[PDB]
Amino acid sequence: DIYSRLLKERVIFLTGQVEDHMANLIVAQMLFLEAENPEKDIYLYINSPGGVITAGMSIYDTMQFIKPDVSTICMGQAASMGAFLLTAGAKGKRFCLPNSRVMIHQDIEIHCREILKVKGRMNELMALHTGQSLEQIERDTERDRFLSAPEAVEYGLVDSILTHRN
Amino acid sequence: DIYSRLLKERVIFLTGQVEDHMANLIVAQMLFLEAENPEKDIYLYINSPGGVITAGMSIYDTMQFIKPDVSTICMGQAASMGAFLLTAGAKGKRFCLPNSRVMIHQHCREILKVKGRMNELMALHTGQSLEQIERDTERDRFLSAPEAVEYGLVDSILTHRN
Amino acid sequence: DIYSRLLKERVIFLTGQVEDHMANLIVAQMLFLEAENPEKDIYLYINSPGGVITAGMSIYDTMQFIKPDVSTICMGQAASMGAFLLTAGAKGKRFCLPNSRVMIHQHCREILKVKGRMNELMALHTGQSLEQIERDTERDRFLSAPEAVEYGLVDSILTHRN
Amino acid sequence: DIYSRLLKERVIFLTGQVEDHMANLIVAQMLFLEAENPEKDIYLYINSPGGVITAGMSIYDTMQFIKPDVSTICMGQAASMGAFLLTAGAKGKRFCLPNSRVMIHQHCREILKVKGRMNELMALHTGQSLEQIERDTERDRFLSAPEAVEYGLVDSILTHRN
Amino acid sequence: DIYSRLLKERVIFLTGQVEDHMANLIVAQMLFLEAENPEKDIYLYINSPGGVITAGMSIYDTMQFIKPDVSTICMGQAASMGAFLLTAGAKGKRFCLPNSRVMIHQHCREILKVKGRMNELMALHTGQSLEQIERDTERDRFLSAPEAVEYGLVDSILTHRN
Amino acid sequence: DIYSRLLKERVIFLTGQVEDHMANLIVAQMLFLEAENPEKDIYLYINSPGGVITAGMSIYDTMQFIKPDVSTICMGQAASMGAFLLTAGAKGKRFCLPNSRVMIHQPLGHCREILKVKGRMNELMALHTGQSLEQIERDTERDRFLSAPEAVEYGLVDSILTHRN
Amino acid sequence: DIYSRLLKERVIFLTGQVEDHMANLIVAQMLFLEAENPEKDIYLYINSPGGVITAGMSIYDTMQFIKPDVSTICMGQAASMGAFLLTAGAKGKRFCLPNSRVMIHQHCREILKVKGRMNELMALHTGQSLEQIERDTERDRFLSAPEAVEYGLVDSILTHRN
Amino acid sequence: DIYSRLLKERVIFLTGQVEDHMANLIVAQMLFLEAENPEKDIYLYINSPGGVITAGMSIYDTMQFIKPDVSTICMGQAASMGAFLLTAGAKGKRFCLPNSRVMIHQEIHCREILKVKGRMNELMALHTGQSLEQIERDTERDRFLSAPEAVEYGLVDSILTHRN
Amino acid sequence: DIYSRLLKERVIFLTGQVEDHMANLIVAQMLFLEAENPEKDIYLYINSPGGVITAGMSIYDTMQFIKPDVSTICMGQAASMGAFLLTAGAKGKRFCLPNSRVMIHQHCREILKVKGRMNELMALHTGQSLEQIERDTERDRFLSAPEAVEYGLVDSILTHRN
Amino acid sequence: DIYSRLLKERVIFLTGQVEDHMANLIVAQMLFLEAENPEKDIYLYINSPGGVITAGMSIYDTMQFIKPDVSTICMGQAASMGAFLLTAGAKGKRFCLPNSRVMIHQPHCREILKVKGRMNELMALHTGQSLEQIERDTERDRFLSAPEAVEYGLVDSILTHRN
Amino acid sequence: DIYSRLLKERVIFLTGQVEDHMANLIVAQMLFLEAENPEKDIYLYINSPGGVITAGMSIYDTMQFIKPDVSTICMGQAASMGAFLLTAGAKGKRFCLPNSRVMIHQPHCREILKVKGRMNELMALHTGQSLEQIERDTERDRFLSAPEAVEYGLVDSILTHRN
Amino acid sequence: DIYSRLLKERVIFLTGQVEDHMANLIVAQMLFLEAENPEKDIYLYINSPGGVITAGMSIYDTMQFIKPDVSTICMGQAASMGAFLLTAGAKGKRFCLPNSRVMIHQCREILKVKGRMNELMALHTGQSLEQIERDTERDRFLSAPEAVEYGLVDSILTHRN
Numbered sequence A: 001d002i003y004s005r006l007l008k009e010r011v012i013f014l015t016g017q018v019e020d021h022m023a024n025l026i027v028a029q030m031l032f033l034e035a036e037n038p039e040k041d042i043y044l045y046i047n048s049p050g051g052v053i054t055a056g057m058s059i060y061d062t063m064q065f066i067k068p069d070v071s072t073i074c075m076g077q078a079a080s081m082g083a084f085l086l087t088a089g090a091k092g093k094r095f096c097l098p099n100s101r102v103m104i105h106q107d108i109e110i111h112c113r114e115i116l117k118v119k120g121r122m123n124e125l126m127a128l129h130t131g132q133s134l135e136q137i138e139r140d141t142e143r144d145r146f147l148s149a150p151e152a153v154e155y156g157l158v159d160s161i162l163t164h165r166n
Numbered sequence B, C, D, E, G, I: 001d002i003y004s005r006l007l008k009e010r011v012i013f014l015t016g017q018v019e020d021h022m023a024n025l026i027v028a029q030m031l032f033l034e035a036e037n038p039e040k041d042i043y044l045y046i047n048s049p050g051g052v053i054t055a056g057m058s059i060y061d062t063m064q065f066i067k068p069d070v071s072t073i074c075m076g077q078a079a080s081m082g083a084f085l086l087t088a089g090a091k092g093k094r095f096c097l098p099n100s101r102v103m104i105h106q107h108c109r110e111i112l113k114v115k116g117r118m119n120e121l122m123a124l125h126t127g128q129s130l131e132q133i134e135r136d137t138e139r140d141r142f143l144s145a146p147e148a149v150e151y152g153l154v155d156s157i158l159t160h161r162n
Numbered sequence F: 001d002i003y004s005r006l007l008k009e010r011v012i013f014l015t016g017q018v019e020d021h022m023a024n025l026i027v028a029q030m031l032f033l034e035a036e037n038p039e040k041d042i043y044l045y046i047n048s049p050g051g052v053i054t055a056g057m058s059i060y061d062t063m064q065f066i067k068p069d070v071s072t073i074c075m076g077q078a079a080s081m082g083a084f085l086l087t088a089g090a091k092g093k094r095f096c097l098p099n100s101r102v103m104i105h106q107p108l109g110h111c112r113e114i115l116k117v118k119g120r121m122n123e124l125m126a127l128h129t130g131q132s133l134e135q136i137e138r139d140t141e142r143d144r145f146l147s148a149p150e151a152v153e154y155g156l157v158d159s160i161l162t163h164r165n
Numbered sequence H: 001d002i003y004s005r006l007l008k009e010r011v012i013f014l015t016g017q018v019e020d021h022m023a024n025l026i027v028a029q030m031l032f033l034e035a036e037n038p039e040k041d042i043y044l045y046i047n048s049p050g051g052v053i054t055a056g057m058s059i060y061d062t063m064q065f066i067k068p069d070v071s072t073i074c075m076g077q078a079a080s081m082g083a084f085l086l087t088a089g090a091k092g093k094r095f096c097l098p099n100s101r102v103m104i105h106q107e108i109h110c111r112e113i114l115k116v117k118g119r120m121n122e123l124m125a126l127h128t129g130q131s132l133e134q135i136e137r138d139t140e141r142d143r144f145l146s147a148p149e150a151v152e153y154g155l156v157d158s159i160l161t162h163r164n
Numbered sequence J, K: 001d002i003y004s005r006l007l008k009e010r011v012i013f014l015t016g017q018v019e020d021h022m023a024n025l026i027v028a029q030m031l032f033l034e035a036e037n038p039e040k041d042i043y044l045y046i047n048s049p050g051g052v053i054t055a056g057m058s059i060y061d062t063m064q065f066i067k068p069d070v071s072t073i074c075m076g077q078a079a080s081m082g083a084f085l086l087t088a089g090a091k092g093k094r095f096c097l098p099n100s101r102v103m104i105h106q107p108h109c110r111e112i113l114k115v116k117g118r119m120n121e122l123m124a125l126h127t128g129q130s131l132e133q134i135e136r137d138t139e140r141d142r143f144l145s146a147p148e149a150v151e152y153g154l155v156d157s158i159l160t161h162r163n
Numbered sequence L: 001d002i003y004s005r006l007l008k009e010r011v012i013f014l015t016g017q018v019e020d021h022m023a024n025l026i027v028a029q030m031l032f033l034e035a036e037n038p039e040k041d042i043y044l045y046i047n048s049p050g051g052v053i054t055a056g057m058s059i060y061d062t063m064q065f066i067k068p069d070v071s072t073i074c075m076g077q078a079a080s081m082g083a084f085l086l087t088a089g090a091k092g093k094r095f096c097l098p099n100s101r102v103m104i105h106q107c108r109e110i111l112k113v114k115g116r117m118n119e120l121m122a123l124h125t126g127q128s129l130e131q132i133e134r135d136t137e138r139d140r141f142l143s144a145p146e147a148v149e150y151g152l153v154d155s156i157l158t159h160r161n
């Protein structure tokens, strides 16, 4: 199994729709690697169109909680909940491969109330990670747009562009 | 296997719809762990929207019965039965991650009795009065990690680990 | 594998709807454990809402035949055929967990035969009258953990592990 | 896999529909068991609603060919081909568990010829007459565990272990 | 598993309907047994109702090609292509079990062409006349174990191991 | 696994209808056998009714590229893409089991691109069978089976595998 | 597993539809081989009708990013994304087997943006003008192996292991 | 249409499972006959296992509401809502065919579910002549009445032997 | 519509599986034929394997209640309920066409009650005993049109409009 | 055709799920009856568990538009939109039969609040209830017997028997 | 047939998903009523969530072509293609029932942008708004109430009661 | 029925896929109208994305065959076969509605048939056989006037006057 062998090189993959089980499988992997060695870096390859907020947040909170710095490489695309986790990687360790696309955007009374709290919480965290203002993120997260690798770096969404192994 | 390897540090996951067989899987692990070492603590991660009530109660009863303290870290969400089992954790060893979400939610003779019995246990674990639980479960309640501590659903929040 | 590794502490799980496939998988585990050590007690966890009468009766008959006592622990629920098998465990070793719940009910002529025998068989196991069984199974009587001990359907409630 | 370990106890299962592929797996095991030890009895557990005759006849004729006496133990039910395979067990070693059902019931000229061939073998294994079997099998024949011993389909009720 | 050990006794099964993928698995087995010991015989049990003329004739030509004799033993039924491949076995080493049926039974340009080829090979193996082979191909014909010996499909019936 | 054992005897099996995945597997085994011993022959048994062109054409091109001679033994049937790959075997090492059944007239895959491919097939087949283009084109379009000895005559295969020695 | 074995030779396969997970499997294989020996060439056999742009642009970006040159052979066919990744291989080291097919054919504002970037890369690797690619990708353009070499999609035909 | 013709004989059929659309027809038919002659009796031929309660009550109330007395005639069976609407027939005009049989059974949600259950017993008892509590435990047990029994249960009046 | 003007000739057809909604159509036809003229005989042609009991029973009771006699005619087949309904006609006006199959066959307390009832109603109409009606329904019985007249099932055969 | 004949006495039936094509049929009937007689009352019998809001609101507005008063009668049940169209009848001409069940409960976030809010106003406007009573009743389900319905102000009066 | 009797009062219904065959049925009745009397008004009731372009465009072009002025009335909802046809009615004669609901969210990118630009041109044209405005407002998600439809100029006026 | 009543106005409709059975109904109509009055014209409203060739050609040949002039009118769209028939109407009387879309785009025996239709299409549109062989290869969308300049259609119907 390749995925197991690449785990020995502390590399984890995030592929496809984010839902409970693949998230739990990522959280499992992160906690495992930390256990093996809490000092070295985890490498998370993100290629996801997005998915369930509740699922993706478990992955986020694991990245922050564990002592290892998690490094997020975006290959292919990082849209919405994907983008969110890509930008949530250890500071100075977030990358795009050159041709990858990042994108942002995602009874009655009691539930509308809750999505609005959640939405505000996302924006607050995402501004904090990209270095943008809370206000700027609000405008841009409504804008159903795609950033290129360079633009994601200009936007503070990732740090630099992976281009060639040195 | 990553999950079986994670069982060598006494960590069990409860993920997704709480259903009869995934419930059984959890009970099998807890028993197994207890058998390896009935002293050391178990850590049960909970990311579930809820599920079948009899299936949930089997998870519950095993946690109380088995000798080890079962710690309950909630990640993502613990709604309905998820919340129940989260609050079911060893007193002092129940945690939310920061951006976790928790929710209070959910033959007539039997179901009315079943509900009442939950409401009681619910109060017991949170430390809120029967009446307090009784109003919130009826009318869908959401709780963030700080609120989850406030309510008594969990003890503290996990943020980082040094 | 966690079910197999529990099997070598003589633990067996009966879960979900009873039916031939799951049934003669339990019957195969019992015969297995007997062969290893015909003296040591087998432990059978029961969380089923009932099932196929054939399938269940195969487990009933297997529990009796084998030398080892089959202690039966109810968790979550034990409805009709599941209640039958719970009660059909080793007299003296029929446990409940506190928040479980037991419950009973269920060529036409010869269906009434099978009905009659079940009634008889459960009276033999509970300690009750064939009249009371015939009364309480006509209407679907729900039983709490303590109420189950009162009815002789189970022996004592497992609460904590000493 | 529990079942292949029980093959070390010379136990072979016969569950579910009697069709060609499963029937072959029975044969293969019996033929394998003979290889290991030609003297020691084989134990064919039979919980089957019956199926294809030809599939059943492979199992039947293999039983008679190998050296080991094949002891048929019935459980749950043994209908049509199931019954037939059960009654086909070694004379003196055909058993039943207390609550097991047993049943006997069921391109043209050959149909009436296979029918008769079955009846002859039925009567020759039960101790009955092919006059008696013909008249008696024709419909809805649910012989209970005792009825089956006093029809001569099996030899005794297995209740408990030696 | 079971089949890969019966292969250490040079024993192969032809189970169910004949088609390319099962046929190909059998040709792999025969080739393998030849590779291990070209001298010792192979043993091919057949319970087939028939199948693809293509798939069968690949089994046929491997049997005829590989050094070892392929003794055919029949159980249950050998209909059409199975009947064919039962007769295709080594002269002298073709066997029936007592209650095993056989059935000799089965763009014109070629279908007739290959038909004649079957009938010719059929008569070459059974020692029958090409017209009686034609009578039984065209109009269906069943043969019980002893009839198959008399008709010439197989050499003898197997009764017991000795 | 029986098929993995027979790989130590450098025997690959082309069973059923030819498509990308089964074909990739066959290619994978050819390259693998070449890896382990590039001189010793490889034995492709074919029982196939045909299939996709590009699936088969990777099996074909692999056969021609690798150092080993790929003997094709045919059993059961080789129809269309089956027949093609049968005839594609190393020369002098292409066989028929006596009651095998070779056949030609429709492979499997914008009309002028199809006619170009169809022409390429007919050419390669002609080259392998030693026939003219003329003939291949006439007879492919004709709906009839070939027996083992007829495929020998036509130059599809070289001889009949008969009995082992 | 045969694909494991060829990975010791640094051979990877890209068969069928280009899709997020199968693609992750290729990225994963390429990284593994990089780890093992960053100098020695990787060989990527392609037989695909194309697929998803994100899936393929992860295989593309890696091919460029990892140290070793990813030589690419095309067998059978490489259509749309297949062709693109085929022409993305190391300069000097892109091949077609003799009888293969290469083929180049294809919110909505960003769809045109992606298509443009795509065409620009296609031109860069083929040594062709952007506007030429823009016509060939639009009107479905088939290419024989010699036509793929002339077009500059691949470098040479790969006829025999010289 | 055969049913159309039998309608100007003032005959309507309640057949199969009781649900909104067929019940809506039965009500439309009864509303229609009232329009014709408000005094002449309607004859409702019942033959049904039962169905939805909301559906059944739309029939029941249209029977009680319209001027005409609705005569009822069980044929084959009248189970559950079939048993209910059969006994709802105009006092003194409820019938069974000799070999026809009758049978009677079938959180804030619970509150209302028990209300209905309570009401249906009160209407049953009221129409059957039995006490409210007689009906109560006699629906929990599933009850299979013969035609003569249906009269002894006070559910129907008499049996139908032949025409006059 | 054929059946409309053929109902002007007072002919009804009972064809197929006798269910509620087709039974209701027959009842309507009868009541309708009565209001037209309550003394001329209605003619019911039965070609049915039978079906639901409650359906057939309403058809039965109507025939009796309505004044005009319901002369039955068996064409094709009258089996189970169709067979029953056939014998239900006016004693003196029940017919079988020369070539017609009549066969006799067919909440447990009630099934045994209603099965009893069927029998005695069949018995009273036929002139047979309760014993013989019970005897012939358990296993098969195919009465030919002559045998049916002999059985007291119908009155006489209709060979010709003479 | 029974329903056509009943239409001659200005009787129209609302039955089952409220959706486009069944509602469109009801509006076509209501417009027809206006075209025949602009003055005389129309009687809409209701037996519906609810359905699509858009569909119900085309019934709602047709009832208010056409000159004829549309008298609503309730048979069986009137839940969600059912209860809404039931209250929409002519002030004074809204009935339940004695055993009519009436249920009051709720069937692009803030969008729906705006629709929800408007419905409540109409409800409180037809029932004479407080806006907050309609708000509270339609956030937890609410059951009404025929008498309860009358004192809620949902319908006007019960229909016992004929005249 | 209630719709056929309604047709004899020059009333047509456009209900549900707009697709080729039901749109043909509408185009059929329009030509028919033009043949019946070319000078007198036709009335189209719209309760559609939208649907296919080509199908919706045949109705549109038929409306503009026939000599009768087509009066559009919105009952229930008119979203996207429905709203497009709603606003396409003869100027003056376009209506919304009070609680009706109008929406204008987006109904080969080479061609699909050409079609989109055309749609917005025609929309702006029929509304009296700028192309630039219609371009921005169709961009994202909001329903319009009957009055908001009148102010934006989708529709000319709310139908009150039968005057 | 609406369509029988419009049939009095010698109006026929082509809607949806052009398969065998709908095509028959159209040929059955066109024949009926000719029987009713052979001089007076037939107005065929096309709104179709194309379909079966044998079906389309039965409509096409009936049109040419019968004495009434068949004025084709496009509404919505006329793609491939739909287009084919649109431009197969009586010359002079082939129309588009303002917002119509025409499209033209679709073994040894196939290439024959392809030519045969390219010939008739070229013969009906005016422009050369080769010019058509190019434009049917490309995913073509002609608007109303674009269609006119191409000669698929003769003018745009704007208003009844």
Ligand SMILES: [Ca+2]
Pocket: G063, G064, G065, G066, G067, G068, G069
């Ligand atoms: Ca590189």
Ligand SMILES: [Ca+2]
Pocket: G149, G150, G152, G154, G155
């Ligand atoms: Ca070059």
Ligand SMILES: [Ca+2]
Pocket: J130, J131, J132, J133
């Ligand atoms: Ca208020």
Ligand SMILES: [Ca+2]
Pocket: J132, J133, J136
């Ligand atoms: Ca209030």
Ligand SMILES: [Ca+2]
Pocket: K063, K064, K065, K066, K067, K068, K069, L159
């Ligand atoms: Ca105009």
Ligand SMILES: [Ca+2]
Pocket: K069
């Ligand atoms: Ca005007």
Ligand SMILES: [Ca+2]
Pocket: K136, K137
């Ligand atoms: Ca705006």
